[PDB]
Design an enzyme around this catalytic site. Structure first.
Site, PDB file in Angstrom:
ATOM      1  N   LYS B 120     -29.565 -23.171  40.339  1.00 40.68           N
ATOM      2  CA  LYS B 120     -30.868 -23.684  40.782  1.00 40.68           C
ATOM      3  C   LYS B 120     -31.356 -22.924  42.016  1.00 40.68           C
ATOM      4  CG  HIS B 170     -37.529 -37.605  36.527  1.00 41.51           C
ATOM      5  ND1 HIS B 170     -37.013 -38.557  37.383  1.00 41.51           N
ATOM      6  CD2 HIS B 170     -38.722 -37.232  37.058  1.00 41.51           C
ATOM      7  CE1 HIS B 170     -37.853 -38.746  38.388  1.00 41.51           C
ATOM      8  NE2 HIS B 170     -38.897 -37.955  38.215  1.00 41.51           N
ATOM      9  CE  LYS B 172     -39.468 -30.376  29.646  1.00 39.84           C
ATOM     10  NZ  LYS B 172     -39.357 -29.004  29.101  1.00 39.84           N
TER      11      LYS B 172
END
Ligand SMILES: Nc1ncnc2c1ncn2[C@@H]1O[C@@H]2COP(=O)(O)O[C@H]3[C@@H](O)[C@H](n4cnc5c(N)ncnc54)O[C@@H]3COP(=O)(O)O[C@H]2[C@H]1O
Ligand SMILES: Nc1ncnc2c1ncn2[C@@H]1O[C@@H]2COP(=O)(O)O[C@H]3[C@@H](O)[C@H](n4cnc5c(N)ncnc54)O[C@@H]3COP(=O)(O)O[C@H]2[C@H]1O
Ligand SMILES: [Mn+2]
Ligand SMILES: [Mn+2]
Lengths: 759, 314, 191, 96, 90, 90
Positions: B120, B170, B172
């Site tokens: 990340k 969180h 989709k």
């Protein structure tokens, strides 16, 4: 899914449309989508749309209104893929009607067999097969002479199961262990893996091709030589055959991968092997001419089959040009002290290695092998422990452990052979129904001399023909008859002759004297006439003349090999005749198989056309079908699997036809199996006029139609009684007759569905 | 039709496994499926020319992570290339590395790309070296991704954006392409931004660059170096078969080679709008816990403007 | 008939616990303890043939009582082992009707007779008579199909694990009973 | 109706009647090793054994043999039925 | 005890081994053809019926002179060893 | 497919060897006691039922955490090896 398409409206099932940024792209997606579709129940026009879409004139973009009616490539369709449907037809048929010749019983729940764990992409040792490829027959022979250890031929894949399981072990079960065999047993002199009764049994009872077994295996085990058992005169066949047939069989056997040919004559008549031996030499392969052991050389009373006998013949056979001298103790008659003496003497006498083969019938197999080993024998035949003992070969591991502390050892890896053995331990259970040899010593064979195999077999016929109570009488007669024939070597096919006559003499209350007295009035079995006619060679010492005269009845016995006297076969003619019968071009192998077994070859073809290559099925499915709710995996080829499940089994209609309800790779499939062995009344669907149902309570006098009959409105379908006064049920329209739920006799009530008439 | 790739092994299950297989058969490429024990009945196993069991003995998920078994099978079967799909091993360094090493084409970017984007942070890094915006916690944002394709020959296209803002806890749920509620100018700043980044590292094959948007600014947040579930909606508005493109790229072609047919960036346009809904056994009357069992009835739908990509619903 | 149970493998010097001196010491103590016949009880069929020759030979050199041998044909070497024992002087051996012999039982009484009838040393048996008796058992055995569960073929693995004739079939049963039928090899290794 | 415990419950097969050796009626059992014991005891039998050049046989058919192969399930009825014959036809055994 | 023919029929008996009036199958197979009717007179050796054993026909004969009684099988029926087929009264 | 309880009931299924959700008998014997109900939650090792084998009780356990499904046997029932007893869903 589940719709019923009818004949009234258009046929359209679905409009498939595909799109691309270009025509070219759209064409690829149409291609994929047409192929990926699955529709079953009804035929579709998909094979045709594909042809259109694949045609390069379609892809070009340049076609016009007369494209189709002038591109006749569009109407040639491939050979359909319905391998699934066939597999289902087989399974459904054995599941409902049983497999022929065995008691029909629920399929057991079996252990998955223990497969040896081989490192992935490990490395097969070269072995005896490489020596042959490099240095030929003489190279292998020289090698053998160098070895102090005793060498092992493994009979697990042939004589072992021929003896214990009626030769029923199937190629699937054999391929599955072959890889491991190659890796774990590289030191074997050879694998006896073809010949004997396997050739015809594969076709006749297993619905599979012996050549495929031999060829698939050849690749799977490329390091160790393949051995076969060949009857000299008649190859693996059931007759006599002309020389060119024998030479062609041998030639192909050799190309296809067989390296060592054990060649024998059932009367030890050397002339009977001369064609075969010569053919093997000419193919570049190893010849193991064999002498069949009989009698008892430790007993001087017996003056015919003596050590000098075996010595003379050992020399003639070296003269005739054998690489290895084989001693074939078909009945397990060679006691241990006689083995020591016989092998010793034969080693003093001939300069070829010696290969011994006995049967553990008496319980003295290993002991006899240890004697043979002390005297110098070069090679012995053993089998996996789990397929050894009794009428099979002694155990390969049994032998290793019995000799590992002697002056002379075997080259084997115990542990490896134990791991292989586990596979057979498990797989043997599949063959319970054929595992019928009473598997314990039978020393009586020293009295009667019936070979390993034919004991179980002859007993069967005795039982079959109502003589199971009198088996001891028949074993006594078997001995009498051998004396009547002047004492012959008894092995296939001489053994049959002795068994045929023994049965007959018991059946008909005939003694030995009875035959000498009333013999000209008695009609003897065909194999006996044939025997005395000379049709399976000449016995050592020749026929007894008085008995020959009585049997033949003026017939004139030939005195040469029956192959000398036979019209050579025309391979060009026979291949064309067969092509006709098969409906396509046969291989050189199909042809020789048809020559050797015309009837059973064609019955095999008939079968694989109906059900496909059933070879591929797991053995429990092959013999027992499927349990309700069971799922199996059928491997068509590496990577290509039919996940098949059995959901349920429909009730029967009048002729016995049931619907079997399957799922195959996700697709529900319904197949019709006629129940041959049948030991609730459906009412009509009032809505549907294709249903014809009874109007009043009464019975069925006569059904006037068959399924598939065409009818015209008003026609007579069947006749129903109502208090004895006949009345006639007619077709309510033109159409085709479908299922019939009743039979002449059946009692009926109003509403009862009788016949179905499709439009 | 294909240079090196004659056979692809699809190292996944379910919907994306079937998608790849379908793209392979369209390009005349042979397919090899893998299934876990648990997936012995998954319908993706019946869509390939070959199938083999994988992970024997491992747990359900671990079995589809058995790199070395997958390589064994790839090799055993003659597979020139492996498509890892999405999820599972699709973003796993050892697995790409490990294919490259075996001379088995990995239908994706190079291992170093999974490395710079597996983390990340080292992504944040690469976005700075690219000279594009980043966050230094943002108010009522749209979540917006840009589809990138790039070949071995230094061509790199974008296929516009997707609005993935409709999320539950969180995750989709509905995806729409293009993002109807932004301006043409913003759309290009964002799209060009993602090209910039992906060229800056010579990104290879299909990948997606994610951005958060507030009003008129945007901020890079993530790169997924793989196909995505929602690629579907992009194929629909641009006309470009993304999965075939992947295959073409990995075989060795260039975006615009006439066979691959990808237009020049100028000629790639938006046609219409598309929505994706993912139908799952998540029970809304039971806290979205996945139901299980046999599906006794399954009847999908059709007609104009409708697309279906089936997972384990048959 | 005080008996010594055979285990290990006296042809293997690695193994120092159950050696020929071991069997000899105990043979004497047992004569001292006052046995008429010395019995050797090879419960597992572990006595290979060359070791039989040596063992019986030695024990004959050592004690002045007759010797009675009992093995199991588990390995397939029973008869061979008996022939060795016979060459070395053993006085008595245990056999069974052919139809109840082999595998985890005794070697065949008729098997033995025929294997030795041309050697330096014979058995006193009437083959024909024993064959006639044997037929009775051939028939009667079918009654016990449901209990005839020993896999009846050589198991040389007994040289690794040393499970007696009987307990192999038996221990397998419990393994299967308790859900371990899949893992029988693990259990034989653990044994 | 309920089956025998611990075996699968199945139709009773149709069995052969077993072959019993034909013994002349009121024939004459040979003395054997049991007589030696009765007359001369343990030492007598031992001395006897030492005299024999042949190897002697103990028959395990009625015990260890079926203990091993048939779970020791062979029943007295089946054993008594052959015992007479055993005595007449196998008199040379050292022991049973 | 009275005999009624059931006109509307929608377990296999084994033989009584003791009784030789019972004629039973020797091996597993099927019935090709029943050659006799109830009440037929037979002489020892005569043909009662024909039984298949792996397709190879074999013929079950009268074990004595006598009269045919009940018949438990029909052309078609599948059979096992011990299965009672025909009864022949003396 | 709808589930209806038959209140008025007047062939033994074997296991699907492939599927470990199927719990089947190991040896021939009978069912002493069924210790669970449909829908019960279990943890690996827990007691599902108890099966006799020649009078000597032995206890069939859950091969994993899961939920109990259909039960094909009852206290009393006689059983053979392969016989499907209980189903344990994951
Ligand atoms: N030197 C020799 N003289 C005679 N026979 C022998 C012999 N060596 C071995 N044999 C035969 O072979 C058998 C087993 O010997 P071992 O040691 O493998 O029993 C003996 C005997 O029948
Ligand atoms: N003189 C001797 N020396 C060594 N071992 C002998 C022997 N006589 C017999 N044996 C052993 O007995 C076995 C069989 O001999 P036979 O003859 O009955 O194999 C041989 C060997 O293991
Ligand atoms: Mn043979
Ligand atoms: Mn014992």
């Amino acid at each position: 899914q589940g719709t019923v398409v009818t004949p009234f409206y258009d046929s359209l099932l679905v409009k498939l449309c595909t799109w691309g940024m270009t025509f070219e792209q759209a064409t690829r997606k149409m291609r994929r989508n047409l192929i990926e579709f699955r529709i079953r129940g009804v035929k579709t026009n998909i094979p045709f749309l594909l042809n259109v879409v694949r045609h390069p004139d379609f892809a070009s973009g340049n076609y016009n209104t007369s494209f189709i009616d002038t591109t006749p490539e569009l109407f040639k369709f491939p050979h359909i893929r319905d391998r699934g449907t066939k597999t289902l037809r087989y399974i459904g048929n054995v599941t409902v009607n049983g497999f022929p010749g065995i008691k029909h019983r629920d399929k057991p729940v079996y252990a998955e067999p223990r497969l040896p764990k081989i490192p992935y992409g490990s490395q097969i040792s070269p072995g005896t097969k490489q020596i042959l490829d490099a240095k030929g027959p003489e190279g292998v022979v020289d090698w053998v002479k160098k070895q102090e250890e005793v060498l092992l031929t493994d009979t697990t894949l042939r004589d072992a199961h021929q003896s214990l399981l009626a030769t029923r072990v199937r190629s699937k079960d054999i391929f599955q262990i072959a890889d491991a065999m190659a890796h774990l047993l590289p030191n074997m002199f050879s694998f006896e893996m073809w010949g004997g009764a396997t050739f015809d049994v594969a076709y006749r009872f297993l619905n599979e091709d012996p050549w495929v077994r031999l060829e698939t295996l050849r690749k799977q085990i490329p390091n160790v030589m393949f051995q076969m058992l060949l009857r000299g005169a008649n190859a693996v066949g059931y007759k006599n055959y002309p020389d060119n047939v024998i030479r062609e069989f041998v030639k192909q056997s050799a190309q296809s991968g067989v390296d060592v040919f054990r060649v024998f004559d059932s009367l030890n008549w050397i002339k009977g092997m001369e064609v075969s031996i010569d053919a093997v030499r000419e193919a570049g392969k190893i010849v193991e001419a064999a002498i069949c052991y009989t009698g008892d050389i430790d007993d001087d009373t017996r003056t015919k089959y003596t050590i000098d006998y075996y010595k003379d013949m050992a020399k003639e056979l070296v003269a005739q040009g054998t690489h290895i001298l084989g001693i074939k103790d078909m009945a397990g008659l060679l006691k241990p002290q006689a083995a020591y003496r016989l092998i010793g003497e034969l080693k003093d006498t001939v300069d070829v290695p010696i290969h011994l083969h006995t049967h553990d019938t008496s319980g003295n197999g290993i002991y006899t092998y240890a004697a043979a080993v002390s005297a110098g024998v070069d090679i012995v035949d053993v089998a996996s422990s789990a397929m050894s003992g009794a009428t099979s070969q002694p155990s390969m591991t049994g032998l290793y452990y019995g000799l590992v502390n002697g002056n002379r050892q075997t080259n084997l890896d115990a542990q490896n052979s134990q791991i292989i053995n586990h596979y057979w331990e498990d797989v043997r259970h599949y063959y319970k129904d054929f595992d019928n040899a009473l598997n314990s010593p039978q020393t009586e064979v020293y009295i009667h001399e019936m070979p390993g195999g034919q004991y179980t077999n002859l007993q069967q016929q005795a039982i079959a023909v109502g003589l199971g109570d009198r088996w001891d009488e028949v074993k006594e007669m078997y001995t009498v008859v051998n004396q009547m024939f002047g004492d012959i070597v008894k092995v296939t096919p001489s053994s049959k002759v002795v068994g045929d006559l023994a049965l007959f003499m018991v059946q008909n209350e005939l003694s030995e004297e009875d035959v000498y007295e009333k013999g000209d009035t008695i009609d003897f079995p065909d194999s006996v006439i044939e025997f005395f006619m000379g049709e399976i060679g000449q016995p050592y010492g020749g026929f007894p003349e008085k008995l020959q005269k009585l049997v033949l009845k003026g017939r004139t016995p030939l005195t040469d090999r029956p192959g000398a006297l036979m019209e050579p076969v025309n391979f060009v003619e026979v291949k064309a005749e067969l092509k006709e019968k098969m409906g396509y071009e046969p291989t050189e192998k199909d042809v020789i198989s048809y020559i050797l077994y015309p009837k059973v070859f064609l019955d095999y073809q008939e079968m694989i056309n109906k059900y496909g290559d059933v070879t591929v099925l797991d053995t429990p499915t092959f013999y027992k079908g499927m349990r309700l709710g069971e799922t199996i995996e059928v491997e068509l080829e590496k990577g290509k699997i039919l996940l098949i499940k059995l959901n349920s089994i429909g009730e029967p209609i009048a002729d016995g036809t049931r619907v079997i309800y399957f799922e195959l790779n996700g697709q529900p499939r319904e197949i019709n199996i006629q129940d041959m062995n049948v030991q609730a009344r459906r009412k009509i669907d009032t809505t549907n006029p294709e249903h014809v149902g009874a109007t009043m309570t009464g019975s069925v006098i006569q059904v006037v139609v068959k399924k598939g009959d065409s009818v015209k409105k008003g026609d007579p379908l069947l006749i129903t009684e109502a208090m004895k006064m006949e009345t006639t049920i007619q077709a309510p329209f033109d159409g085709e007759v479908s299922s019939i739920y009743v039979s002449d006799g059946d009692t009926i009530e109003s509403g009862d569905l009788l016949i179905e008439v499709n439009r | 039709m294909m240079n090196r790739i004659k056979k692809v092994l699809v190292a996944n299950r379910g919907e994306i496994a079937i998608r790849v297989m379908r793209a392979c058969t369209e390009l005349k490429i042979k397919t090899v499926a893998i299934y876990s024990q648990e997936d012995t009945g998954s319908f993706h196993r019946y869509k390939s020319d070959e199938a083999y069991l994988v992970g024997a003995g491992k747990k359900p998920i671990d079995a589809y992570l058995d790199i070395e078994n997958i390589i064994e099978i790839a090799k055993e079967s003659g597979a020139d290339a492996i498509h890892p799909g999405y999820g599972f091993l699709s973003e796993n360094i050892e697995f790409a590395r490990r294919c490259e090493q075996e001379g088995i084409i990995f239908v994706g970017p190079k291992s170093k790309h999974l490395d710079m984007f597996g983390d990340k942070i080292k992504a944040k890094e690469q976005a700075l070296l690219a000279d594009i915006p980043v966050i230094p916690c943002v108010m009522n944002p749209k979540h917006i991704e840009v589809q990138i394709l790039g070949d071995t020959h230094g061509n790199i296209v974008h296929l516009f954006e997707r609005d993935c803002s409709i999320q539950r806890r969180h995750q989709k749920v509905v995806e729409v392409a293009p993002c109807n509620a932004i301006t043409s100018e913003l759309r290009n700043r964002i799209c060009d931004a993602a090209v910039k980044l992906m060229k800056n590292v010579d990104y290879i094959n299909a990948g997606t660059v994610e951005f958060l948007v507030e009003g008129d600014d945007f901020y890079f947040i993530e790169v997924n170096p793989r196909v995505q579930v929602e690629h579907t909606i992009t194929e629909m508005i641009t006309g470009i078969d993304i999965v075939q493109s992947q295959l073409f790229i990995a075989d060795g072609y260039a975006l615009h080679d006439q066979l691959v047919a990808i237009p020049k960036q100028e000629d790639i346009h938006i046609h219409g709008s598309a929505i994706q809904s993912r139908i799952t056994t998540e029970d809304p009357l039971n806290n979205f816990m996945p139901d299980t069992g046999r599906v006794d009835t399954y009847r999908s739908t059709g007609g104009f403007g409708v697309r279906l990509d089936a997972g384990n619903g048959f």
